[PDB]
Design a protein around this ligand. Structure first.
Ligand SMILES: CCCCCCCCCCCCCCCCCC(=O)OC[C@H](CO[C@@H]1O[C@H](CO[C@H]2O[C@H](CO)[C@H](O)[C@H](O)[C@H]2O)[C@H](O)[C@H](O)[C@H]1O)OC(=O)CCCCCCCCCCCCCCCCC
Ligand code: CLA
Ligand code: CLA
Ligand code: CLA
Ligand code: CLA
Ligand code: CLA
Ligand code: CLA
Ligand SMILES: CC1=C(/C=C/C(C)=C/C=C/C(C)=C/C=C/C=C(C)/C=C/C=C(C)/C=C/C2=C(C)CCCC2(C)C)C(C)(C)CCC1
Ligand SMILES: CC1=C(/C=C/C(C)=C/C=C/C(C)=C\C=C\C=C(C)\C=C\C=C(C)\C=C\C2=C(C)CCCC2(C)C)C(C)(C)CCC1
Ligand SMILES: CC1=C(/C=C/C(C)=C/C=C\C(C)=C\C=C\C=C(C)\C=C\C=C(C)\C=C\C2=C(C)CCCC2(C)C)C(C)(C)CCC1
Ligand SMILES: CC1=C(/C=C/C(C)=C/C=C\C(C)=C\C=C\C=C(C)\C=C\C=C(C)\C=C\C2=C(C)CCCC2(C)C)C(C)(C)CCC1
Ligand SMILES: [Ca+2]
Ligand SMILES: [Cl-]
Ligand SMILES: [Cl-]
Ligand SMILES: [Mg+2]
Lengths: 342, 39, 29, 56, 38, 38, 62, 30, 34, 81, 137, 37, 34, 451
């Protein structure tokens, strides 16, 4: 066997500066287009016709406020292909209709797939276990649930996050006001996994860095390590005693420690993805029923929960008309919920 | 009948086949010019 | 405005000039 | 504002409520109150807990 | 042609100053014309 | 409530004094290596 | 006195610039240190002098 | 009853901390 | 409060069943030969 | 090392800078002109500052139909007189 | 939409006479307004007294009328309450009180005309936003 | 404003406060020159 | 001694060329007045 | 080149200044050059502000922090804090800028030309970090120096024109302080005041007599301590309590400056005496209270009885009691009832705000002041859009109080971090394991198991 496939394989798997692989055929064009589309849009492309927003450097926006914004609500879930029935091959009109959004989301998705396949392929060639790709399943679960499943459960892509700093923030505040997303235990598990992952990252780095063996004369300790050396660079034993006496428990097993370091953030993101999947259907943790029944009958009953619902109600009424222009919301001064003075 | 959107579909199909085609042609060509040394 | 970019041009170049001249003359860098 | 479980909160809604805006930055240890009932009304537990916490 | 003719610390210094100038220009643009709020 | 106040004050002063005299108590000497740091 | 002032001050600026590049270069250069030490002394005394000149002339121009 | 449950769960967790700390399986150098 | 009246059984079984599974497994682990 | 020319060799070479002191500014100037001539607005369909609204108009030109969206946008641009 | 000669055309007086401001006068007007007035009147409302705004209709029903260049210029020299009954130069910026509102000291008549013109032009651009307050932000 | 006599130096004066940051940047230029040894 | 046009070269320029073009675009954008 | 690479020094480039720990000549160069940087900034920033300064605008509308400091000393300002002469600012700026040339000269000389070490050169200027006596001696010198500084402030206050006093009877003005408070009961009484609301520790100092008397005390204390330290060497308990190395002293100073930073943050935030609101703008409290004053005034003008006016909550819409009964502005501004300011106090009676004074005695200058401060509340965006976060672009404003408080919080915090870093390192280095654990002598391996 030495046909064209295997020769192609040979070239594809050549050890070069930027590895290519079979996965590269998916990854590189898709990633390049996703990123390029984002830069192109943020630099030059408007959201006037889709959102009634400026979103580009061209219009006077800065890096924080620039975005490639989602299509108009009236587009529904159109793939919005350049050649589709909306744009009909006209690139300018396609851009004006938000074609770049779906462009970025979909090339993005296939790009993530490509990246993970890349992780598998390289793991296979180098002969390591494929836990990096497995851990990468969490970012994918987030991207897919949030940028794809969610709007697919809503009226249109319009309500997906737009690709922009400030736009993403809007997405956060919308989820608060409308979904009370903080109250959602899947988001809470997300929080635990992210903050816990950061905690582990910091604590592990610091523990290693503060239990190093003196392996050089240099007061700067980085050179006193050799990649190929057999010995552990830091004392597991001293670290374990330290935390045991400080905190009460400690890792004693390095393999467990590091698996746990994989587990925590990956599982967190996964839980959060599940919650957002719920939000696609508006299947929220919005209320505690016992709370509403009590507060409804008893006007002296107040919790931080009821206070947060007031905040949510404000968010909805004040932001909805401009945030959802396709609805033709007109909220008279007199209907806007406001406390005293403000 | 071929509606404008079916024509669009075909245009897309062709564009994809072309992109992938030129890609595989080019990669195979390059793999053939720059063979790995064995033995 | 032209004057300001000229001032910061001389002030701005000064440091690297010190370094460049010392490097050329094999100075005590 | 009710913060405690027995007064109608669950784990997610429950809180120790911050001390009164009437106090501001005034130091409000238990002994500045005329009674525990007053201390509780104005949110003394908040100041006691967080100050001990930060020290700790 | 020959590698080493132009010292790397100068390339770095020049490139760096270039980035500072361009970014600086972007910040000037934050206060003037579109996006300046005026 | 005055008795509570005096109690707490005494307690606090007590623990603080333990802290201060404690660290004053040849703390640099309390390590597994070089003790002569005076 | 404005001519004396405005040029004494321009000269103060120019000389300042010259010292700013020249002094460290002198300090760290191996050769011509004998000539450098005297040029730095001269530049320094002249700098001090220009500061004082500008300072005095200030009150007859403001 | 809700409250009983919550406080109960919490108490179980503190007890768990206690066992997890003082009655852990000891780490051994082999 | 007008809580879900099954919240009690739900929570209780949610804690107890896996807790029990784990305790079963631990205990049968300790009694294996050293 | 993977066989490619080291980056530091390249970017410290005379020939690289002979090429790129031409190519880089040329690209920069090309982008500049892409905007300053106004071509960018036309390519991308971005409103100029004088083309967001008709003189007396205060309504956003929101696209409200999926399939006549193209026509909708054209009508909106036409209404800028 | 553009800042046309027509937009910059606002009432000079109560007798039907208009004045056409230059783009440079309008810009000067914005700058000077920000400098001297906006600390309280940002966006056309009034922070130390929100009952009174800078809406054109509101200026029209003040006494004497303030919906014209002359009215506003006179106000900036000798401000009154909304009914004309008391002179409030002592608590409101004016040329008359430049001693106590030092920002009014370098304001020239031209500056007053320009500021006035900003006050009349802005609602023609911004609509309900001018004097709308936060509801319309 | 500066006294009228000094008005010609406004642009220079406009730039001066930032020079200290330039000393920090200079330290890196210098270190670049000795190869961060 | 070294090849010039490699996969790495191509990759680098696919990012760098548009990058300089866009930055030039945006620079021009800083002088745009309404 | 001695000790200017990692192999010889043991320190990488990014820890480069540690190569200077034991090079007292070069280290002196570093220090003097750095002092040059500080004086340079004082001068250039002052000239910038002045060139940028419009005398008929309030200073705080122009982003000034240094001119406010010069002005606080009584230079260039008159009644109400009005600018009468900008020339003193010019002098301060210029003299700093010139001095900076000198410091930079000495610094650069010491850094690259001067003696790498001073010990063979001079026994007086040379030093060993572990030489405790030489250290307390140098410390003593710097203490006498600081004391002289404080007395320079006293001199400015008593004999060379005085200080700006926002509290001056009949209105703020530069005033000579003829009777500074010398009573140790009052002066150290400040040091024993609570740091919580209504006490505010040293930040509560509300009259220049106390400030000047305090600095007399501090000057004499610092000079006495300096002499003390030149004439003494550290006692046994101090020898046994501390680490004696350069990095350790560094850590101590970092800690102290951190502490001082936080103190300055609160000082510029709350105090309107040594940070007069005329120059720096209103405090947050000042402004909240100013809103309340403004609308109380407005509505009373409209015919409201502000004493008996019940708000929606049951609390007085304009006026209510503090938790100790004082009459205070009501609504949220209730938190700020500890605020004190020259524009509000005339309305103050024995029991707090006096209803009859409110009804009858409010002067137009108070309404004006309240409006100004209300609308120059210390709120604004990072790009300096004044007002609440939801306010529209229009006003180019961030209060100097915010710039100075925030800057010093960030700095004080990182200096606390630096304190921890360097104190812990001084400990590890003194004990001899700052580079890591001895593999053949791992301390924990000789310890009994925990369980
Ligand atoms: C070695 C260190 C020893 C530490 C051991 C622990 C011992 C206890 C320490 C107390 C902690 C401070 C608590 C209270 C904070 C406070 O309300 O601070 C505010 C006070 C001032 O308070 C205010 O001071 C004001 C004084 O102004 C008055 O007087 C003025 C005169 O111009 C005006 O008239 C003004 O209107 C008027 O109100 C008012 O009285 C206010 O009501 C009053 O609250 O500042 C101050 O005391 C001065 C600064 C205090 C420190 C600042 C806190 C930062 C510390 C945390 C850092 C983070 C750590 C990171 C770790 C990693
Ligand atoms: C004490 C610190 C301090 C303070 C309070 C101010 C205050 C002010 N300055 Mg001044 N300034 C300072 C230092 C300071 N400056 C210095 C050192 C310089 C020399 C470069 C200048 C130069 C300067 C100029 C040239 C001007 C001002 C002006 C102003 C005002 C506007 C500031 C601005 O818009 O923010 C913009 C905010 C930023 C640029 C963000 C800063 C964020 C930094 C990078 C974060 C720092 C973090 C920490 C220290 C780093 C540690 C890292 C960690 C890993 C260890 C404002 C009143 C302006 C003015 O209004 O004059 C009338 C004006 O034009 N300043
Ligand atoms: C205020 C900031 C500061 C200061 C005062 C110093 C001080 C100093 N550094 Mg340094 N350093 C700094 C920041 C600073 N560092 C930073 C941020 C870094 C990390 C990037 C380092 C990294 C570093 C390293 C790695 C090393 C030092 C060392 C030294 C010292 C020797 C310098 C040398 O030999 O010159 C050689 C350079 C030249 C001859 C070029 C010219 C330099 C001059 C001083 C510039 C003067 C310019 C000025 C505008 C002229 C005005 C003159 C006018 C008044 C007449 C010197 C004392 C070295 C040391 O410890 O020696 C034992 C050492 O190896 N530093
Ligand atoms: C704390 C700052 C400091 C320190 C400790 C030193 C230390 C030393 N310097 Mg100096 N130096 C400094 C700053 C400092 N320098 C500055 C800023 C400059 C620029 C002008 C110089 C320029 C300098 C030179 C050119 C030389 C030295 C050298 C000397 C050494 C001997 C000096 C002598 O014998 O004095 C004996 C005492 C006198 C001559 C009388 C001193 C009169 C003073 C100035 C009166 C005013 C004091 C006043 C309180 C200062 C307040 C300033 C404040 C506002 C900042 C000595 C190691 C020499 C050296 O190292 O030889 C190889 C050497 O030749 N230095
Ligand atoms: C106890 C020390 C102390 C204190 C509390 C003050 C307080 C005050 N001074 Mg300062 N001042 C001091 C020392 C002090 N000064 C000294 C030594 C000098 C000479 C260098 C000056 C020079 C000075 C001037 C020139 C001016 C002031 C002004 C001010 C006021 C506004 C500035 C400010 O916010 O500083 C806040 C102060 C600090 C952050 C220092 C806190 C000190 C703590 C309490 C002690 C720390 C000690 C240390 C850690 C312990 C040593 C260790 C030992 C136990 C072994 C302010 C009221 C201004 C003013 O009054 O305008 C009218 C003004 O312009 N001062
Ligand atoms: C920067 C200024 C400075 C510095 C670095 C030092 C540093 C030194 N001094 Mg001090 N000293 C100073 C100023 C300074 N002094 C001044 C101005 C005076 C005159 C008042 C003195 C008088 C002095 C004496 C009389 C003595 C020292 C001693 C010492 C040494 C050890 C002191 C130590 O353990 O403090 C740690 C402080 C304590 C152990 C005191 C108790 C700690 C309490 C609990 C802390 C409370 C403060 C807290 C943070 C809150 C502040 C507010 C509070 C007032 C309510 C040490 C070398 C001793 C020495 O050995 O002499 C050679 C010694 O006996 N010094
Ligand atoms: C007086 C204050 C002071 C002093 C004298 C020192 C001095 C010393 N420290 Mg440092 N340190 C300080 C404060 C201070 N520290 C603080 C506040 C922190 C907390 C962040 C640290 C944290 C620190 C660490 C973590 C370490 C040191 C180390 C060292 C030593 C070598 C410093 C070096 O060469 O850096 C070279 C300088 C650089 C590489 C530049 C740093 C760049 C900074 C972080 C960004 C500046 C941001 C700027 C303000 C705003 C943006 C401007 C823009 C142009 C970027 C030296 C003994 C080392 C050591 O432990 O020595 C034994 C060491 O590793 N220090
Ligand atoms: C050691 C070193 C370091 C640092 C450096 C330094 C820190 C030094 C310094 C200091 C300095 C700081 C120096 C200098 C400058 C100064 C001068 C040079 C002065 C002059 C001035 C003038 C000229 C005046 C004029 C004026 C008049 C008087 C009026 C008004 C206007 C004007 C402004 C014009 C580094 C990092 C590099 C590294 C290496 C080593
Ligand atoms: C006052 C007076 C004076 C002044 C003097 C002075 C003092 C100056 C100084 C100077 C300075 C002091 C400067 C410095 C410099 C340079 C720069 C412009 C900066 C930078 C950076 C860079 C660009 C970097 C880059 C790179 C590195 C190299 C490595 C790594 C990587 C990176 C990227 C970072 C005069 C004469 C004017 C007269 C008037 C007034
Ligand atoms: C979509 C489109 C597509 C594709 C296109 C593309 C793909 C392009 C690319 C291009 C790209 C690819 C872009 C460029 C770039 C970048 C820029 C736009 C600029 C920049 C940066 C920067 C400005 C820097 C700054 C900062 C940071 C970031 C870093 C460091 C620090 C600093 C401050 C420096 C096609 C045609 C097929 C069809 C459809 C349409
Ligand atoms: C001018 C002023 C005045 C006065 C001032 C005063 C006179 C103050 C003072 C003096 C002083 C009196 C200050 C302070 C304190 C000190 C310190 C800061 C210390 C610390 C402590 C520590 C740090 C120690 C450490 C440790 C211990 C604890 C234990 C053992 C170990 C050791 C030793 C390490 C007044 C306020 C009226 C007003 C305003 C202005
Ligand atoms: Ca125009
Ligand atoms: Cl209205
Ligand atoms: Cl309020
Ligand atoms: Mg612009």
């Amino acid at each position: 066997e030495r046909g064209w496939f295997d020769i192609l394989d040979d070239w594809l798997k050549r050890d070069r500066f930027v590895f290519v692989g079979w996965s590269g055929i998916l990854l590189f064009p898709c990633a390049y287009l996703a990123l390029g589309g984002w830069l192109t849009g943020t630099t030059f492309v408007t959201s006037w016709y889709t959102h009634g927003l400026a979103s580009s450097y061209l219009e006077g926006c800065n890096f924080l406020t620039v975005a490639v914004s989602t299509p108009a609500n009236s587009m529904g879930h159109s793939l919005l292909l350049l050649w589709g029935p909306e744009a009909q091959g006209d690139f300018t009109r396609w851009c004006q209709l938000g074609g770049l959004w779906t462009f970025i989301a979909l090339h993005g998705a296939f790009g993530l797939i490509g990246f993970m396949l890349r992780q598998f392929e390289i793991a296979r060639l180098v002969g390591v276990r494929p836990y990096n790709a497995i851990a990468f399943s969490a970012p994918i679960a987030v991207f897919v649930s949030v940028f794809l499943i969610y709007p697919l459960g809503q009226s249109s892509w319009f309500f997906a996050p737009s690709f922009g700093v400030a736009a993403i923030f809007r997405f956060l505040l919308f989820f608060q006001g409308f979904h009370n997303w903080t109250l959602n235990p899947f988001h809470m598990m997300g929080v635990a996994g992210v903050l816990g992952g950061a905690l582990l990252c910091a604590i592990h780095g610091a523990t290693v860095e503060n239990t190093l063996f003196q392996d050089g004369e240099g007061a700067s300790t980085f050179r006193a390590f050799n990649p190929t050396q057999a010995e552990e660079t830091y004392s597991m034993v001293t670290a374990n005693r330290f935390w045991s006496q400080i905190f009460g428990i400690a890792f004693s097993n390095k393999r467990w420690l590091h698996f746990f370091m994989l587990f925590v953030p990956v599982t967190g993101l996964w839980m959060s993805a599940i919650g957002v999947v719920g939000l696609a259907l508006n299947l929220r943790s919005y209320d505690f029923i016992s709370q509403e029944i009590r507060a409804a009958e008893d006007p002296e009953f107040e919790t931080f929960y009821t206070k947060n619902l007031l905040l949510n109600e404000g968010i909805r009424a004040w932001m909805a008309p401009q945030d959802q222009p396709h609805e033709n919301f007109v909220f008279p001064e007199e209907v806007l919920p406001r406390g005293n003075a403000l | 009948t071929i509606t404008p959107s079916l024509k669009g579909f075909f245009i897309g199909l062709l564009s994809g086949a072309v992109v992938l085609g030129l890609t595989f042609a080019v990669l195979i060509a390059i793999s053939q010019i720059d063979k790995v040394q064995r033995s | 405005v032209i004057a300001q970019l000229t001032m910061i041009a001389m002030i701005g170049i000064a440091g690297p000039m010190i370094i460049f001249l010392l490097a050329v003359r094999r100075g005590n860098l | 504002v009710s913060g405690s479980l027995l007064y109608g909160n669950n784990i997610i809604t429950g809180a120790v409520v911050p001390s009164s805006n009437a106090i501001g930055l005034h130091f409000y240890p238990i002994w500045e109150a005329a009674s525990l009932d007053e201390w509780l009304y104005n949110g003394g537990p908040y100041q006691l807990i967080i100050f001990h916490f930060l020290l700790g | 042609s020959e590698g080493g003719r132009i010292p790397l610390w100068i390339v770095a210094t020049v490139a760096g100053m270039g980035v500072i100038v361009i970014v600086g220009l972007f910040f000037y643009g934050a206060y003037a014309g579109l996006g300046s709020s005026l | 409530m005055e008795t509570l106040k005096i109690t707490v004050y005494i307690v606090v002063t007590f623990f603080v004094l333990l802290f201060v005299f404690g660290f004053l108590s040849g703390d640099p000497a309390r390590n597994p290596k070089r003790k002569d740091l005076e | 006195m404005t001519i004396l002032f405005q040029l004494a001050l321009a000269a103060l600026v120019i000389l300042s610039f010259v010292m700013v590049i020249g002094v460290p270069v002198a300090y760290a250069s191996p050769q011509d240190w004998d000539r450098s030490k005297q040029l730095i002394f001269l530049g320094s005394g002249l700098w001090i002098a220009l500061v004082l000149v500008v300072g005095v002339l200030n009150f007859f121009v403001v | 009853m809700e409250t009983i449950t919550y406080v109960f769960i919490f108490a179980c967790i503190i007890a768990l901390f206690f066992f997890a700390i003082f009655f852990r399986e000891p780490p051994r150098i082999t | 409060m007008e809580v879900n009246q099954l919240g009690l059984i739900a929570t209780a079984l949610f804690v107890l069943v896996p807790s029990v599974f784990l305790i079963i497994l631990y205990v049968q682990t300790e009694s294996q030969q050293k | 090392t993977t066989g490619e020319r080291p980056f530091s060799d390249i970017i410290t070479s005379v020939r690289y800078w002979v090429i790129h002191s031409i190519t880089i500014p040329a690209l920069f100037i090309a982008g500049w002109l892409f905007v300053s001539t106004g071509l960018a607005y036309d390519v991308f369909g971005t409103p100029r500052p004088d083309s967001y609204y008709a003189q007396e108009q205060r309504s956003i030109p929101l696209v409200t139909d999926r399939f006549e969206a193209k026509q909708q946008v054209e009508t909106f641009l036409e209404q800028l007189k | 939409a553009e800042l046309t000669p027509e937009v910059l055309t606002v009432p000079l007086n109560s007798e039907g006479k208009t004045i056409t401001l230059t783009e440079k006068q309008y810009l000067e007007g914005k700058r000077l307004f920000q400098y001297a007035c906006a600390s309280c009147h940002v966006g056309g409302i009034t922070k130390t007294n929100p009952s009174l705004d800078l809406r054109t209709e509101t200026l029209a029903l003040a006494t004497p009328p303030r919906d014209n260049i002359e009215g506003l210029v006179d106000y900036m020299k000798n401000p009154t309450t909304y009914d004309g009954e008391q002179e409030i130069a002592e608590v409101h910026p004016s040329l008359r009180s430049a001693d106590i509102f030092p920002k009014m000291r370098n304001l020239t008549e031209k500056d007053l005309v320009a500021i006035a013109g900003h006050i009349l032009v802005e609602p023609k651009i911004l609509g309900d936003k001018w004097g709308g307050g936060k509801v319309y932000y | 404003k500066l006294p009228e006599a000094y008005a010609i130096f406004d642009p220079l004066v406009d730039v001066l406060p930032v020079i200290p940051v330039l000393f920090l940047a200079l330290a890196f230029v210098w270190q670049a020159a000795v190869g961060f040894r | 001694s070294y090849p010039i046009f490699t996969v790495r070269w191509v990759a680098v320029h696919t990012l760098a060329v548009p990058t300089i073009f866009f930055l030039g675009a945006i620079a021009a954008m800083q002088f745009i007045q309404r | 080149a001695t000790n200017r690479d990692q192999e010889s020094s043991g320190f990488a480039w990014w820890a480069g200044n540690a190569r200077l720990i034991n090079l007292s000549g070069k280290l002196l160069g570093a220090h003097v050059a750095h002092a040059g940087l500080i004086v340079f900034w004082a001068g250039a920033m002052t000239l910038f502000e002045l060139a940028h300064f419009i005398p008929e605008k309030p200073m705080y509308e122009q982003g000034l922090i240094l001119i406010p400091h010069i002005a606080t000393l009584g230079w260039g300002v008159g009644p109400g804090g009005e600018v009468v002469d900008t020339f003193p600012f010019f002098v301060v700026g210029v003299v700093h800028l010139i001095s900076s040339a000198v410091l930079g000269f000495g610094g650069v000389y010491h850094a690259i030309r001067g003696p790498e070490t001073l010990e063979e050169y001079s026994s007086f200027f040379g030093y060993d970090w572990k030489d405790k006596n030489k250290m307390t001696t140098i410390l003593g010198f710097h203490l006498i120096v600081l004391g002289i500084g404080a007395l320079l402030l006293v001199a400015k206050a008593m004999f060379f024109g005085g200080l700006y006093d926002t509290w001056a009877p009949g209105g703020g003005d530069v005033r000579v302080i003829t009777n500074p408070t010398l009573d140790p009961r009052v002066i150290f009484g400040y040091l024993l005041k609570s740091p919580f609301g209504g006490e505010g520790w040293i930040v509560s100092v509300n009259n220049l007599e106390d400030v000047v008397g305090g600095h007399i005390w501090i000057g004499l204390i610092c000079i006495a301590g300096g002499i003390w330290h030149i004439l003494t060497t550290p006692f046994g308990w101090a020898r046994r309590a501390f680490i004696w190395s350069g990095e350790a002293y560094l850590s101590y100073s970092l800690g102290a400056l951190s502490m001082m930073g936080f103190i300055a943050t609160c000082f510029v935030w709350f105090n309107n005496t040594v940070y007069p609101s005329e120059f720096y703008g209103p405090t947050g409290p000042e402004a909240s209270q100013a809103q309340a004053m403004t609308f109380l005034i407005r509505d009373q003008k409209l015919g409201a009885n502000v004493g008996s006016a019940q708000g929606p909550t049951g609390l007085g819409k304009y006026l209510m009691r503090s938790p100790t009964g004082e009459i205070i502005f009501g609504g949220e501004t209730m938190r700020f009832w500890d605020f004190r300011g020259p524009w509000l106090e005339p309305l103050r009676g024995p029991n707090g705000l006096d209803l009859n004074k409110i009804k009858n005695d409010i002067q137009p200058w108070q309404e004006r002041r309240a409006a100004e401060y209300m609308t120059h509340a210390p709120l604004g965006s990072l790009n300096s859009v004044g007002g609440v976060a939801t306010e529209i672009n229009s006003v180019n404003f961030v209060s100097p109080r915010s710039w100075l408080a925030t800057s010093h919080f960030v700095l004080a915090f990182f200096f606390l971090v630096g304190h921890l870093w360097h104190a812990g390192r001084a400990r590890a280095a003194a004990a001899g394991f700052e580079k890591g654990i001895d593999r053949e002598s791992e301390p924990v391996l000789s310890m009994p198991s925990l369980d």
